[PDB]
Write a protein that binds this ligand. Structure first.
Ligand SMILES: Nc1ncnc2c1ncn2[C@@H]1O[C@H](COP(=O)(O)OP(=O)(O)O)[C@@H](O)[C@H]1O
Ligand code: BEF
Ligand SMILES: [Mg+2]
Ligand SMILES: [Zn+2]
Ligand SMILES: [Zn+2]
Lengths: 129, 411, 207, 49
């Protein structure tokens, strides 16, 4: 078992102070606001998760899935209420997340020791060729 | 006569009654004359046999009332016809006080007109007029039924309040603090009973045969066969095929008023000769215009934007307090699922930290406000807040409308 | 794309792709081809048209259709000349003062009555008589100096919004019916249409 | 522990009338104390996490 927190409609985001050192380009922090269903909230977050967002390349009117445990953002998609802006759109619009934006939850999974052995023997991580 | 007479003057219908009673006396505030010239008083409009072609005139306009002649005559009618309105009986009302409810955005000149017409002709002794808003805080004085619905989940008068009225004329949202309402964060929505009836006319004209001369049918249909989208516009559209109502034209030869039927129920299997209008989409699309005025291609912001901006004008310390206790007032709010829908919408808009709750009085809010005003007459703070005849005489009519009940004073 | 394609080096705009059956072979912009507040997205003419449609929805009878210029002038202080020139719209009329109803109301309360005289003859009484025979229009209220200009300021701009005109997204569904899927704009009229029957009903009169 | 000391002293001082949500809805001072205690509870939970 493992307990995790998560945050889930994106309202707005602002990236970023003076270098005052060896920082050629400085992005101190990024402010992001989420809407959800049971109320909205804004927060501040690291530049690294901002670069992760840029890798995801999400828009401003979107719904995302950010897990603060691993600092990874997943683009759930567009917002359903933001439909009919254009007559066509390939991406599935997807409804808005239900409940509180800041979700505390716990998960329970059953595995076997052979699964751990296989995972360690043949790791799937890696970005190089 | 210790107990005053409470008059909630409505643009559509007025509620006159003694402070003793628990229910108001309902009398129409209008004038409809048949095309042949035989006019009929406001209370006698309901007894007429034809409603197809009438000429209408309502003394109360969008803002307020200007010509006091019809209102004075109607006030005398509800004040000098003990036979038509049983129980009530009065000679002069000399020692009788007056408790009235008039809007906070009244014209100072028109407020002076109202004060002079109520005092210097009928010979009152004590008056008190204030908007229906301030009296609702007095709901903590007397026990009553008050359904509080939580937005998030699936002295005696209360200083903290923020109340919305939605009657026939228009809609008004007021913040009340310390028992003294704020007169700047107040926001007016033009969608009232008139505008909903007009939208009903236009949308039936988009669907079924026209009735634009026949507006009483429009009002009856609006009061009867509508229901607010419980969840969303699209999902309520998914119920248009399965759910539908059918209204029948009122045949003046047979029945002065029509009826609405549901095909599921077989309790009314009687066939009828007249034509039947099917309403399958306009039941729920019509109430949606408050949240989506652009359906009728208007530049009007909307209810949620209005309440959000009105909160924005309020000081930050008092902002979270108002949403924690919201009371629903007005005859438009009797539409089913409206309170829950608006609660869900504004709670979704408002951030997570503060949870907003909406209090609904069961049934219509008009009689709820009337019994609240009757309790205010019962409430002894009215004794300390009242005025007398000598105060009116020693000063001019301008002082009474510019100092005590004046709105710029409380700004 | 298919590898190796022939180009003639003329035009060759990688972001401009125009293709048709060539019935006119003309760009819609070749040479300017011609001849968040909602007050910004919709221009002054459009917001004024929305306003006059709003006021024309206010009325409940035929007689107040020519009363629309008077009501709109009372609302926003525009002369009736431009109301009749640029809006491009789609005794019962003169307030309730008919003497016929005045003498007919006697039969309304004739069931029981016990009137008595208690009155004087003063300036207040004269003003009461004037109010009783009121016969006044909102235009007369506003043109005259009986109401302070600060009262006008706090009655007109205490209602309007100025910065946030929309907080929820717009559904933008067809005008005739409510087909929520596969909506599209019309060829000429530029109004959203959904169904075949909707297009047939719209192309005649609305388009 | 630093937050818990303040939380427990606040709960001891006014833990009888400020606990109910009925008084939280109708308040000017007590609702602020309830907000402070819930905020410090959330803060300590986040710190433990
Ligand atoms: N149960 C109901 N369902 C729908 N509409 C209603 C219902 N009851 C009353 N109404 C509408 O509310 C309006 C009454 O407004 P009212 O309280 O008279 O405003 P005012 O006090 O400004 O005259 C009527 O136009 C009526 O159509
Ligand atoms: F006078 Be009301 F109830 F708008
Ligand atoms: Mg009223
Ligand atoms: Zn259509
Ligand atoms: Zn078209």
């Amino acid at each position: 078992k493992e307990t995790k927190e998560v945050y889930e409609e994106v309202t707005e985001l602002t990236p970023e102070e003076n270098p005052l050192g060896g920082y050629g380009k400085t992005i101190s922090h990024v402010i992001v606001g989420l809407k959800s269903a049971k109320g909205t909230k804004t927060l501040r977050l690291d530049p690294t998760i901002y670069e992760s967002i840029q890798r995801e390349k999400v828009s401003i009117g979107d719904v995302i899935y950010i897990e603060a445990n691993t600092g990874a953002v997943k683009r759930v998609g567009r917002s359903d209420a933001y439909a009919t802006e254009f007559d066509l759109e390939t991406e599935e619009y997807v409804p808005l997340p239900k409940g509180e934006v800041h979700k505390k939850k716990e998960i329970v999974q059953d595995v076997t020791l052979h699964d751990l052995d296989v995972a360690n023997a043949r790791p799937q991580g890696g970005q190089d060729v | 006569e210790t107990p005053p007479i409470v008059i909630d003057n409505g643009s559509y219908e007025i509620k006159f009654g003694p402070s003793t009673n628990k229910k108001p006396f309902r009398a129409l505030n209008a004038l409809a004359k048949d095309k042949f010239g035989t006019s009929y008083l406001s209370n006698h409009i309901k007894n007429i046999k034809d409603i197809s072609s009438i000429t209408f005139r309502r003394p109360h306009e969008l803002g307020q009332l200007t010509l006091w002649e019809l209102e004075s005559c109607i006030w005398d009618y509800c004040l000098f016809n003990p036979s038509e309105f049983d129980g009530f009986d009065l000679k002069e009302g000399k020692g009788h006080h007056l408790v009235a409810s008039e809007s906070c955005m009244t014209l100072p000149e028109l407020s002076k007109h109202a004060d002079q017409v109520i005092f210097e002709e009928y010979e009152f002794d004590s008056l008190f007029k204030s908007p229906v808003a301030v009296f609702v805080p007095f709901t903590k004085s007397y026990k009553g039924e008050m359904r509080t619905i939580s937005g998030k989940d699936e002295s005696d008068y209360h200083d903290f309040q923020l109340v919305i009225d939605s009657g026939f004329n228009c809609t008004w949202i007021i913040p009340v603090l310390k028992g003294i309402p704020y007169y700047k964060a107040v926001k007016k929505l033009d969608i009232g009973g008139r505008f909903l009836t007009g939208l009903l006319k236009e949308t039936l004209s988009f669907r079924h045969y026209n009735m634009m001369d026949e507006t009483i049918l429009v009002n009856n249909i609006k009061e009867q066969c509508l229901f607010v989208s419980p969840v969303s516009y699209f999902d309520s559209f998914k119920t248009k095929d399965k759910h539908a109502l059918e209204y029948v034209l009122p045949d003046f030869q047979t029945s002065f008023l029509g009826y609405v039927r549901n095909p599921r129920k077989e309790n009314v299997p009687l066939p009828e000769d007249a034509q039947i209008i099917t309403l399958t989409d306009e039941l729920f699309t019509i109430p949606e215009t408050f949240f989506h005025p652009e359906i009728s291609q208007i530049t009007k912001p909307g209810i949620v934007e209005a309440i959000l901006e009105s909160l924005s004008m309020l000081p930050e310390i008092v902002r979270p307090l108002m949403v924690g206790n919201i009371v629903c007032t007005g005859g438009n709010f009797n539409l089913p699922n409206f309170a829950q829908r608006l609660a869900a919408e504004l709670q979704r808009q408002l951030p997570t930290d503060w949870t907003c709750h909406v209090s609904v009085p069961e049934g219509d809010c008009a009689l709820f406000g009337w019994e609240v005003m009757s309790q205010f007459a019962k409430t002894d703070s009215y004794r300390k807040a009242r005025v007398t005849r000598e105060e009116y005489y020693e000063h001019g009519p301008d002082w009474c409308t510019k100092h005590r009940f004046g709105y710029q004073n409380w700004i | 794309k298919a590898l190796v394609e022939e180009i003639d080096k003329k035009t060759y705009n990688p972001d401009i792709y125009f293709t048709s059956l060539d019935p006119q072979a003309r760009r819609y912009t070749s040479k300017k081809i011609n001849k968040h507040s909602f007050e910004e997205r919709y221009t002054q003419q459009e917001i004024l048209q929305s306003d006059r449609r709003f006021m024309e929805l206010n009325t409940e009878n035929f007689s107040d259709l020519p009363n629309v210029p008077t009501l709109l002038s009372d609302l926003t202080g525009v002369p009736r000349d431009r109301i009749e020139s640029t809006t491009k719209p789609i005794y019962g009329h003169g307030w309730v003062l008919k003497p016929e109803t005045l003498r007919e109301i006697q039969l309304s309360y004739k069931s029981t009555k016990l009137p008595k005289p208690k009155r004087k003859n003063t300036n207040r009484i004269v003003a009461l008589k004037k109010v009783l025979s009121s016969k006044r229009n909102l235009h007369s209220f506003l043109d005259s100096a009986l109401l302070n200009l600060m009262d006008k300021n706090v009655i007109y701009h205490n209602v309007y919004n100025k910065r946030y005109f929309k907080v929820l997204p717009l559904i933008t569904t067809c005008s005739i019916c409510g087909g929520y899927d596969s909506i599209s704009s019309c060829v000429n009229c530029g109004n959203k249409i959904c169904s075949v029957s909707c297009f047939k009903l719209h192309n005649e009169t609305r388009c | 522990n630093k937050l818990r000391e303040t939380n427990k002293q606040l709960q001891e001082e006014f833990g009888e009338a400020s606990f109910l949500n009925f008084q939280d809805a109708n308040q000017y001072f007590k609702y602020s104390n309830k907000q402070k205690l819930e905020g410090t509870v959330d803060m300590l939970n986040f710190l433990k996490m």
